[PDB]
Amino acid sequence: FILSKIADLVRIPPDQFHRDTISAITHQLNNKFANKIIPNVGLCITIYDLLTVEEGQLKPGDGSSYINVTFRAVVFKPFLGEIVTGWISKCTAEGIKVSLLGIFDDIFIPQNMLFEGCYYTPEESAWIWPKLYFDVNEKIRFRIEREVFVDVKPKSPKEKPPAYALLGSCQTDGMGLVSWWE
Amino acid sequence: VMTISSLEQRTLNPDLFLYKELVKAHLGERAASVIGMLVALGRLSVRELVEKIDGMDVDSVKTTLVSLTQLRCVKYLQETAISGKKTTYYYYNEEGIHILLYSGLIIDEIITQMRVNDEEEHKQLVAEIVQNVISLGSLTVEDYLSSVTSDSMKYTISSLFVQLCEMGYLIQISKLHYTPIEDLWQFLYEKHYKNIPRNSPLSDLKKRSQAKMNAKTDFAKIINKPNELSQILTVDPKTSLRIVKPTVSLTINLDRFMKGRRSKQLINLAKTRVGSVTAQVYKIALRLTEQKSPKIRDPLTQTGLLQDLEEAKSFQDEAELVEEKTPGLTFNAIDLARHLPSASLINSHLKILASSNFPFLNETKPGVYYVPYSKLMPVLKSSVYEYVIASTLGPSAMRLSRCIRDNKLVSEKIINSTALMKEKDIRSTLASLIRYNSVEIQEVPRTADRSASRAVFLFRCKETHSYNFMRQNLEWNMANLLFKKEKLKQENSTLLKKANRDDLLPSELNQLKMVNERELNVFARLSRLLSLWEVFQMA
Amino acid sequence: DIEFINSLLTIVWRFISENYSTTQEILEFITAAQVANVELTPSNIRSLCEVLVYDDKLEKVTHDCYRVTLESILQMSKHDKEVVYFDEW
Amino acid sequence: PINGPITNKERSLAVKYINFGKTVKDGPXXXXXXXXXXXXXXXXXXX
């Protein structure tokens, strides 16, 4: 988690005139970002405070209220090398894909830098170490290494979806299972 | 599809991007900006840099200025106007970026031709000395001598210093040596137009002879000033051996570096047409006589002024007679097997280099023999160019090229007959020949007066257009070469930074060997076509 | 017709190596009469002369004759490299 | 064209070329007053 500082312009309809500005701008800003991904600054969660707000203007052919304000929104990314709790979900032979419940399943760690004795089997047995192994529903500690950013394809109303994707290297001992200790 | 074929970058950057590409690898960012703009718009003013780009005014400009000055990447000129104040205009300076493209290639010939000594400490010594020269762009003797460690031999590094001045190579820093050839001619043209005390309005054509002849003799003293001067370098105070002036600084030069490779091109032609021994006999002659041989320096008056229609020869042959003068007069009398690292007289091996003249050399005066630097170039450009078409396309493309060069401007009637064999395959490679320029197409109708088809056709001339297409081979080869080498960096940048901090894992060492492989080979490809371009820059 | 242009690809093959060869026009007068398959006339004097004149073969030296020098030698990409043509620029 | 892994000497020349380039990138201390004809540039050349 980290706190970004950004600016933006808000359009509030006549329907919200009965309430207070700060309350109106709040709801609007919530409909703006929320769960949506903000480019290059990481993924955003919620909104914090409101500053710099000034007199809003009006365009001739509408009748609404356009206000340009800046605010600090709470976003998400720990840092380059942080270790954080999670667990795997799905799998094939590439590497394990660890999902942190509460943010996204986007985290995926292929097996390259992992322990020297790891291999996938078609036998439906997930993975094997020369110690032991584990599977889904069990908590996993994973470290961050690499981060990538891409653009988006046009939306199609009724695969390459790497909107926000993080991967890492777990080779340092004591990772992937918390009951090995204690 | 997907544009990955690099059709995007293909069309829009002839010349141009070449320059700011090399300085980007050199420095990058702001450094590429100024030079790249200095090319496109040509002549540039200090204030003018700010207007166009909005380049972070006066912080970058003053920083880049002195940065380009030390390595002399900008041609400097200052003057004034009849109105007042002052103005300073910058030009793209000679080729200084080509020298940055050279680098070790220059130092190569420096190391290689520094022998006649045998395998000494010189290797590790001057490698450190020369690399300090080109990098800083200018070196004063004393401040550099201060960099040398104490309580040791001080003249060990000065064992070869006065030997760096040598004959060619490093010369002194002098004054206006960097200067537009057009401008210095105009600045020197003063005191010529200016000179007459209301003499007499007779024979207006004498103003020609006055200014010209007085300019030529004043031009000669300026160009021969950096060439050979024994004043500074040969200074020999007592209580020591010959030692170069501690005050006056030095700089490298175009003289023997451009000469060394030019001889190689002659050797490659020699070695092809004669034995290995004959190439050596012809080599030992060139090594001694390369000093007073203008060669690469030949025109020297060309850039910066008009030639003529009428007086073109009277200009040209005036140079040709001094190209007759110096080689004939000054150059060595017949020697016998000088030193070297076949007994008696080796002139018999010259006689087999004599009896066979065509295509090249073998010009003789009674009592003295030497190779012309004028008539040698046409047959030098011929061979190499013919070998280019030989390399690129098959054997069929070769034969037809000279077929047009035997006679001139004829139709397919006598061509089909006299060329080789078959019509259809000739028309095939005729289209491949006429594909990119170089034969043009003739201009004339058959009784149609330009009207319509069935008119007669002829294939003719066009040398310079069959030249410049080898000047398009200059940048676009080295471009993608160097570029995708640089793109190989930023892609592996995360790896390289990890490698530098390390100076682990199976797959990390894999991509480490990968880039290094590509690195080596791509520099070997660079120097390859580098030697190919250098011969095509003249005539 | 078709018989023509196919007759010049044979008799000129190995005769080169056996050639200083004096009197360049006699060189034909030699070649013109040989193998008993001999062709006809001086029309072949300027034939193999001014056809084979280029593409290595024999050098051109004065007093009408032919030399030999460099023909004896010939008778004896990961990421981005070469492609050595086109591309305009 | 042609080429390939030829002339180890040239490879050494290539290695040197890379080494010389690295030294320039690392570099930017006197430079003095030399050759400056501009008083405005000479003032900035002091530092």
From Swiss-Prot, chain A:
Present with 752 molecules/cell in log phase SD medium. InterPro entries: NA-bd_OB-fold (IPR012340), RNA_pol_III_Rbc25 (IPR013238), RNA_pol_Rpb7-like_N_sf (IPR036898), RNAP_E/RPC8 (IPR004519), Rpb7-like (IPR045113), Rpb7-like_N (IPR005576). The gene is RPC25. Component of the RNA polymerase III (Pol III) complex consisting of 17 subunits. RPC25/RPC8 and RPC17/RPC9 form a Pol III subcomplex. This is DNA-directed RNA polymerase III subunit RPC8. One of its GO terms (cellular component) is nucleoplasm. It comes from Saccharomyces cerevisiae (strain ATCC 204508 / S288c) (Baker's yeast). Belongs to the eukaryotic RPB7/RPC8 RNA polymerase subunit family. Keywords: DNA-directed RNA polymerase, Nucleus, Phosphoprotein, Transcription. The modification Phosphoserine is found at residue 156. GO terms for molecular function: DNA binding; DNA-directed RNA polymerase activity. DNA-dependent RNA polymerase catalyzes the transcription of DNA into RNA using the four ribonucleoside triphosphates as substrates. Specific peripheric component of RNA polymerase III which synthesizes small RNAs, such as 5S rRNA and tRNA. The RPC25/RPC8-RPC17/RPC9 subcomplex may bind Pol III transcripts emerging from the adjacent exit pore during elongation. It is found in: Nucleus. Gene3D superfamilies: Nucleic acid-binding proteins, RNA polymerase Rpb7-like, N-terminal domain.
UniProtKB/Swiss-Prot annotation, chain B:
GO terms for biological process: termination of RNA polymerase III transcription; transcription by RNA polymerase III; transcription initiation at RNA polymerase III promoter; tRNA transcription by RNA polymerase III. Keywords: Cytoplasm, DNA-directed RNA polymerase, Nucleus, Phosphoprotein, Transcription, Zinc. One of its GO terms (molecular function) is single-stranded DNA binding. One of its GO terms (cellular component) is RNA polymerase III complex. Its main location: cytoplasm. InterPro entries: POLR3C_WHD, RNA_pol_III_RPC82-rel_HTH, RNA_pol_III_Rpc82_C, RPC3, WH-like_DNA-bd_sf. It holds the Pfam family RPC3_helical. It is found in: Cytoplasm; Nucleus. It comes from the Eukaryota. The keyword Cytoplasm applies. Residues 474-495 are annotated as: Leucine-zipper. Component of the RNA polymerase III (Pol III) complex consisting of 17 subunits. DNA-dependent RNA polymerase catalyzes the transcription of DNA into RNA using the four ribonucleoside triphosphates as substrates. Specific core component of RNA polymerase III which synthesizes small RNAs, such as 5S rRNA and tRNAs. Present with 2520 molecules/cell in log phase SD medium. Belongs to the eukaryotic RPC3/POLR3C RNA polymerase subunit family. This is DNA-directed RNA polymerase III subunit RPC3. It comes from Saccharomyces cerevisiae (strain ATCC 204508 / S288c) (Baker's yeast).
Curated annotation (Swiss-Prot), chain C:
It is found in: Nucleus. DNA-dependent RNA polymerase catalyzes the transcription of DNA into RNA using the four ribonucleoside triphosphates as substrates. Specific peripheric component of RNA polymerase III which synthesizes small RNAs, such as 5S rRNA and tRNAs. Involved in recruitment of Pol III to the preinitiation complex. Involved in the configuration of an initiation-competent form of RNA polymerase. Component of the RNA polymerase III (Pol III) complex consisting of 17 subunits. Interacts with BRF1/TDS4. Belongs to the eukaryotic RPC34/RPC39 RNA polymerase subunit family. This is DNA-directed RNA polymerase III subunit RPC6. The chain holds residues 171 to 315 of 317 of the full protein.
From Swiss-Prot, chain D:
This is DNA-directed RNA polymerase III subunit RPC7. The acidic domain is essential for its function. It is found in: Nucleus. DNA-dependent RNA polymerase catalyzes the transcription of DNA into RNA using the four ribonucleoside triphosphates as substrates. Specific peripheric component of RNA polymerase III which synthesizes small RNAs, such as 5S rRNA and tRNAs. C31 is involved in the formation of the initiation complex. It comes from Saccharomyces cerevisiae (strain ATCC 204508 / S288c). Belongs to the eukaryotic RPC7 RNA polymerase subunit family. It comes from the Eukaryota. Component of the RNA polymerase III (Pol III) complex consisting of 17 subunits. The chain holds residues 42 to 69 of 251 of the full protein.
